[PDB]
Amino acid sequence: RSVKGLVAVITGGASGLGLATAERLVGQGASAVLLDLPNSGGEAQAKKLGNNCVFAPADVTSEKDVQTALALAKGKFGRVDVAVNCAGIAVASKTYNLKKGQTHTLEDFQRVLDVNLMGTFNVIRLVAGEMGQNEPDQGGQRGVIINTASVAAFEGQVGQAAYSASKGGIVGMTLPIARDLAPIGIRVMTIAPGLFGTPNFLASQVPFPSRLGDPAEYAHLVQAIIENPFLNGEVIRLDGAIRMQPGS
Amino acid sequence: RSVKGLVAVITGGASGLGLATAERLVGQGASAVLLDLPNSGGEAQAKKLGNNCVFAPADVTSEKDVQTALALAKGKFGRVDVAVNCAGIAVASKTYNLKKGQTHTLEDFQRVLDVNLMGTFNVIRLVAGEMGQNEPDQGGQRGVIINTASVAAFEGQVGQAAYSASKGGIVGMTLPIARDLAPIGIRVMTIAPGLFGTPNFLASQVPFPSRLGDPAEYAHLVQAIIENPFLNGEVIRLDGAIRMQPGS
Amino acid sequence: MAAACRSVKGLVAVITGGASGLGLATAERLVGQGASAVLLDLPNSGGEAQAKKLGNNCVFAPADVTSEKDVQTALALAKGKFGRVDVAVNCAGIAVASKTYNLKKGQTHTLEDFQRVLDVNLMGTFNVIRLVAGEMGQNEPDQGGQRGVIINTASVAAFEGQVGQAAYSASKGGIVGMTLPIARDLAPIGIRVMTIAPGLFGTPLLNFLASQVPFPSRLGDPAEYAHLVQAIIENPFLNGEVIRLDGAIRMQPGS
Amino acid sequence: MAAACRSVKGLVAVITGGASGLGLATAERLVGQGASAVLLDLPNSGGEAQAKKLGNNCVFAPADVTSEKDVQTALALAKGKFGRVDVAVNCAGIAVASKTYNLKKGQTHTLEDFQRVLDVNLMGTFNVIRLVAGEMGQNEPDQGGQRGVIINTASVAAFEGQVGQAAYSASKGGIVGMTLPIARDLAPIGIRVMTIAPGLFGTPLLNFLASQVPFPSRLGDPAEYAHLVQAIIENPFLNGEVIRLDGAIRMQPGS
Ligand SMILES: NC(=O)c1ccc[n+]([C@@H]2O[C@H](COP(=O)([O-])OP(=O)(O)OC[C@H]3O[C@@H](n4cnc5c(N)ncnc54)[C@H](O)[C@@H]3O)[C@@H](O)[C@H]2O)c1
Ligand SMILES: NC(=O)c1ccc[n+]([C@@H]2O[C@H](COP(=O)([O-])OP(=O)(O)OC[C@H]3O[C@@H](n4cnc5c(N)ncnc54)[C@H](O)[C@@H]3O)[C@@H](O)[C@H]2O)c1
Ligand SMILES: NC(=O)c1ccc[n+]([C@@H]2O[C@H](COP(=O)([O-])OP(=O)(O)OC[C@H]3O[C@@H](n4cnc5c(N)ncnc54)[C@H](O)[C@@H]3O)[C@@H](O)[C@H]2O)c1
Ligand SMILES: NC(=O)c1ccc[n+]([C@@H]2O[C@H](COP(=O)([O-])OP(=O)(O)OC[C@H]3O[C@@H](n4cnc5c(N)ncnc54)[C@H](O)[C@@H]3O)[C@@H](O)[C@H]2O)c1
């Protein structure tokens, strides 16, 4: 298919991979809702992108906020066809460090799980109901949901336990959610990015091309997933063939 | 090595796979601490297992409770050599069901993540500090940590999104935690069981042997991991070659 | 935005198995999008008729992928006709259905059936890779330092092979296994290496099969394989990876 | 507790590659634990001397795993000596280090090097499987319905192959790929099929290598491979799976 006329809700849409996705899709004729925190810069980004883009302030961990954002999307554009989960946070903290006597805090683990994993699920479960209102297309499809994991789901480095747990959870739930939503024609896919230039040594680690990924390359893969009706239930690494070393 | 004289803390040790693990290890001359909820039956199980087994009441989601349980283990047996994470819960709930108009609750997702994933991490981070007090053995080893994932981490069924997210998180953090703890000689391994006869159609789904797994077979694999010094950073499926169908 | 090739227009692709099925669909899409295609397929295939239908930007190169001499001949033909080769797509393949051992019948999988499937599917793919890599290595790099991109065809059988699929699954698991080391070998000279693992597609290789796919519940359309090929060529950051294209299917044992 | 075989004592194992390295370590452990071992290895190996050292419960069966006739001869020798075969362990294997293409040197991987590694490592393992499965199929089932267990040797190169490892990684990825379909083929007759993927072990196949392993930071001891073999034989519920035995290593590209 083509993305012209589709309505996309993009979490984390004020910055980075989410913003690059919004820019590409709006440039291809889609409408976009940037779902991001208050004072994320989302309003100014939506204004810059023109009248087919609006900002919906929301914390993905809040049922009430996501409900409000989806009602805003419905009032503005009439339907939701695509959801892209880019909202996320990171921490670097070792499980335990004997030399320094330091133990990872429980709260640092919980915070990253809540935003990255529970937040993605919260958006999925609520947007599925919105997509379920669509009449199926000629191929039976009502929507497409795309999540963002990380190569840390597969080769987490020293200090990445919390982040890797959160992203490994995204990977683990991709297939069951695709199976849950198959009877109503919503595809569910995940991208696992490597190292991307969002907000020299890191670049040199990538086999080829030997640079950070361009956010537009993430946006290109999102578009390819929306366009290809047979991509479902899968995780795609987008990473220049990197495999992460253990680090320190 | 042999397990005789080792001290194991076994979460979920009052029932099922954890109890089978305690029974085997105590039978092989190890000491065991059954870490499980109040009114789980843990006290009666510890009494039945004899004077090298004690019950430590604790909720794995509580820092205070796990701290208390580990201090109990230290006071009783002097050290901790092995931790086995079996504490866990389940739910069956579809992400969204159009026919019935039902959406998975946020709380059902959060509850399963908290016990299965955050609870395992809470035990890991605190037991690592305890193991760090041990003098390394002749091969540099201070401890062994074994987690329980599930084949649902890889092929979650309809209704298993929350459970699969939790277990996929266990899988995802295995390698980074092994990397974090490598400098101090604590190995970190995960078992992904298939279908086990803990608390006819399900049995017929297993290729060979065509039955539910015996909890003693999980306990045997735990012992094999403790005994083999070169198993680290890996997930082992224990499942009779099953691959789960989507279900309904 | 980092300088790179983000278009198939003007590129030249050598497509093994190009006379039929997934390879033919790929040739059709790429020629329609402004690329040139060389259909590398067996002399007894319909490749010549297919290349004529596709017009002046498509030619047939007869070759058995298991032969060093034949692949060399095909690549020299490609260079003579179109010059620079930018893309290689490995679709040449065969299948067998044969149980390892069947006690009821007292029947053992033949060694020759295993060898033949390995030779065409795995060794033939490597033969094409090693020779096209040498050709691509002579290319002046593009604006993003790239000299080529190579796309292989595995199968979901590499991950969930069914009863009777031992030989086919071995061959496609080999494809999966070598994707990363070959991407690593060729990274210093700017050749990306990627693999697609299709599920069940409506080619001459293939209702009950359609019903096992979660969504959409049908056989894949060869045009959808071709679309993913084009997406890989146009995305400069996809390298060293296997992508399942399968409607979320996970194969049960079968019989 | 479900009735099953949970001991190696009294079992007979055919071990390919048994004259050296991981296969020899496996034979040593199993014979010490009360099993009988047949070392299936090349006629120009030291298998006879090794079998003599191991005593009356170990014999040498000369054979090239790539030959149907040789493997048939070895299995008939096993049956003549010990009767029933309960276990097969595939350790026979070779390696090559050769880049797909090297632009600086103008050097291309030879087709014959790829073919030879595939033939020994992948086709040879299948040849042994298909023939020993037929032998095991004649066995009266044990107390848990089992007629055999087959254990193969892959490598972590199946998942993270390095520069120069394309051929080896293809062969070991094939082993990984066929593990599940063969387990599915043989499930109705009670033969389990499992694979071990070793990291880096101190055999005649092999300080800097030791330093890459997270913990323990050393080469694996062949005795640790043997211990995992015994654990798989003794655990009735391990089937259709690949187990990494590797100290948590994940291989970087190398050069
Ligand atoms: N950049 C990388 O190298 C990289 C690599 C792998 C994966 N990722 C993942 O990609 C996704 C996007 O990352 P990015 O690099 O674009 O980061 P970014 O920081 O540029 O953008 C993340 C956005 O998410 C928003 N956000 C954070 N918490 C939120 C919440 N609770 N509710 C709503 N919005 C929230 C932020 O305000 C921000 O605008 C994340 O999931 C990240 O983990 C990034
Ligand atoms: N039985 C199976 O088929 C199967 C399959 C795959 C994975 N698993 C996993 O194996 C592990 C053990 O399962 P089981 O079958 O033995 O279950 P079980 O119900 O018999 O035992 C689980 C134990 O965990 C305890 N527990 C629950 N929440 C706790 C908490 N917050 N703090 C401390 N203890 C807590 C329970 O009281 C109980 O004694 C779980 O992680 C489960 O998800 C089981
Ligand atoms: N169709 C499917 O459901 C499916 C699923 C997964 C993977 N695949 C794979 O996709 C690829 C394409 O399959 P298809 O469905 O298009 O099959 P197809 O039979 O339509 O096309 C395969 C082509 O390969 C050619 N070929 C065979 N042996 C050759 C050799 N030695 N040298 C040169 N060419 C040779 C054939 O002549 C034919 O034109 C194969 O690798 C196949 O294993 C197909
Ligand atoms: N040592 C390692 O670091 C390592 C790591 C991963 C995997 N492996 C694999 O483990 C297995 C055992 O390797 P090893 O380290 O013990 O090597 P090794 O060289 O010590 O032993 C291999 C044995 O296989 C035999 N063999 C070779 N070709 C044969 C043939 N055609 N027929 C019969 N026997 C043949 C050899 O004669 C030799 O005795 C191999 O499959 C190897 O690829 C080894």
For residue C89, the cross-strand partners are: C15, C151
* Residue D171: Cβ within 10 Å count: 36
Integer angstrom CA distances of residue D183 from C113, D8, D192, D245: 19, 21, 6, 21
* Residue D133 CB–ligand 4 contact under 6 Å: no
Helix (H) or strand (E) holding B82: strand B82-85
Pinpoint the alpha helices (H) of chain A. Answer: 16-27, 42-49, 63-77, 106-113, 119-131, 152-155, 161-181, 201-204, 215-227
A204/chain D closest Cα distance in angstroms:
13
Strand pairing report for A96-97 and B186-193: unpaired
* Residue D55: Cβ within 10 Å count: 10
Residue of B nearest to A165 (CA): B169
Instruction: Single out the residue of C162, C227, C159, C194 nearest to residue C22, CA to CA.
Output: C227
Is there a binding annotation on residue A31?
Answer: no
Distance CA D54, CA C64 (A): 49
Distance CA D82, CA A43 (A): 80
Pair of tokens at residue D179: 């593990």
Distance CA C42, CA C29 (A): 21
Instruction: Single out the residue of B167, B237, B168, B165 nearest to residue B207, CA to CA.
Output: B237
With left for phi above 0 and alpha for psi between -120 and 50, is residue C177 left, alpha or beta? alpha
Residues of C in contact with B155 (CB under 8 A): 250
* Residue D118 CB–ligand 4 contact under 6 Å: no
Instruction: Single out the residue of A116, A182, A193 nearest to residue A152, CA to CA.
Output: A193
Distance CA C164, CA C109 (A): 9
With left for phi above 0 and alpha for psi between -120 and 50, is residue D248 left, alpha or beta? left
Third-level CATH fold of B1-248:
Rossmann fold (3.40.50)
Helix (H, G, I), strand (E, B) or coil at A49: helix
Distance CA B103, CA A180 (A): 11
With left for phi above 0 and alpha for psi between -120 and 50, is residue B198 left, alpha or beta? beta
Tell me, in angstroms, the distance from the centre of ligand 1 to residue B160's CA. Answer: 26
Pair of tokens at residue B216: 């003693």
Pair of tokens at residue A152: 């840390």
Do A234 and C250 count as a contact with CB atoms less than 8 A apart?
A: no
Please answer whether residues A70 and A126 qualify as being in contact, where contact means their C-beta atoms are separated by less than 8 angstroms: yes
Helix (H, G, I), strand (E, B) or coil at A177: helix
Q: What residue has token string 């050598």?
A: C14
Pair of tokens at residue B142: 């201070």
Strand pairing report for A186-193 and A235-238: parallel
Is there a binding annotation on residue B196?
Answer: yes
Tell me, in angstroms, the distance from the centre of ligand 1 to residue A164's CA. Answer: 14
- Closest Cβ–Cβ partner in A227, A231, A241 for C187: A241
Helix (H) or strand (E) holding B152: helix B152-155
Method for structure elucidation: X-ray
Distance CA B11, CA B21 (A): 10
Strand pairing report for D101-102 and D107-108: antiparallel
Please answer whether residues A238 and A213 qualify as being in contact, where contact means their C-beta atoms are separated by less than 8 angstroms: yes
The pair phi, psi for residue D16, each rounded to 5°, is -75, 150
A163 as an active site residue: the answer is yes
Integer angstrom CA distances of residue D127 from D40, D66, D71, D158: 13, 7, 8, 20
Helix (H, G, I), strand (E, B) or coil at A203: helix
Work out the burial of residue D83: count CB atoms within 10 Å of its CB; fewer than 13 is exposed, 13-18 middle, 19 or more buried. exposed
- For residue B48, give every residue at least 6 positions away whose Cβ sits within 8 Å of its Cβ, in sequence order, or none: none
Distance CA D51, CA D47 (A): 6
Pair of tokens at residue B136: 């390394």
Please answer whether residues A217 and A172 qualify as being in contact, where contact means their C-beta atoms are separated by less than 8 angstroms: no
Tell me yes or no: is domain C1-255 CATH 3.90.1150.10. no
Please answer whether residues D229 and D91 qualify as being in contact, where contact means their C-beta atoms are separated by less than 8 angstroms: no
Please answer whether residues B154 and B132 qualify as being in contact, where contact means their C-beta atoms are separated by less than 8 angstroms: no
Number of H helices, E strands in chain C: 9, 9
Helix (H) or strand (E) holding C194: strand C191-198
- Closest Cβ–Cβ partner in D163, D177, D185 for C158: D177
Integer angstrom CA distances of residue D103 from B240, C73, D97, D233: 48, 21, 16, 47
Q: Please tell me what DSSP assigns to residue C176.
A: H
Instruction: Single out the residue of A173, A163, A76 nearest to residue A124, CA to CA.
Output: A173
The pair phi, psi for residue B113, each rounded to 5°, is -60, -45
Do B166 and A169 count as a contact with CB atoms less than 8 A apart?
A: yes
Pair of tokens at residue D152: 């193969």
* Residue D220: Cβ within 10 Å count: 25
Q: Which residues of D175-212 are buried (b: 16+ CB within 10 A; e: fewer)?
A: bbbbbbbbbbbbbbbbbbbbbbbbbbbebeeeeeeeeb
B61/chain A closest Cα distance in angstroms:
9
Q: What is the resolution of this structure in A?
A: 1.2
Distance CA C218, CA B193 (A): 32
Strand pairing report for A102-103 and A96-97: antiparallel
* Residue C143: Cβ within 10 Å count: 11
Instruction: Single out the residue of C99, D12, D244, B175 nearest to residue A95, CA to CA.
Output: B175
Pair of tokens at residue C211: 């019903």
Nearest ligand (C-alpha, residue B16): 2
Helix (H, G, I), strand (E, B) or coil at B34: strand
Mutate which: C26, C215, C232, vs A, most A CBs within 10 A: C215
Tell me, in angstroms, the distance from the centre of ligand 3 to residue C74's CA. Answer: 18
For residue D194, the cross-strand partners are: D151
Helix (H) or strand (E) holding D56: none
Q: What share of chain C is helix, strand, coil (3-state, %, to 5)?
A: 40, 15, 40
The pair phi, psi for residue D219, each rounded to 5°, is -65, 150
Walk across the sheet containing C191-198 and list its strands.
C58-62, C36-41, C12-16, C87-90, C148-153, C191-198, C242-245
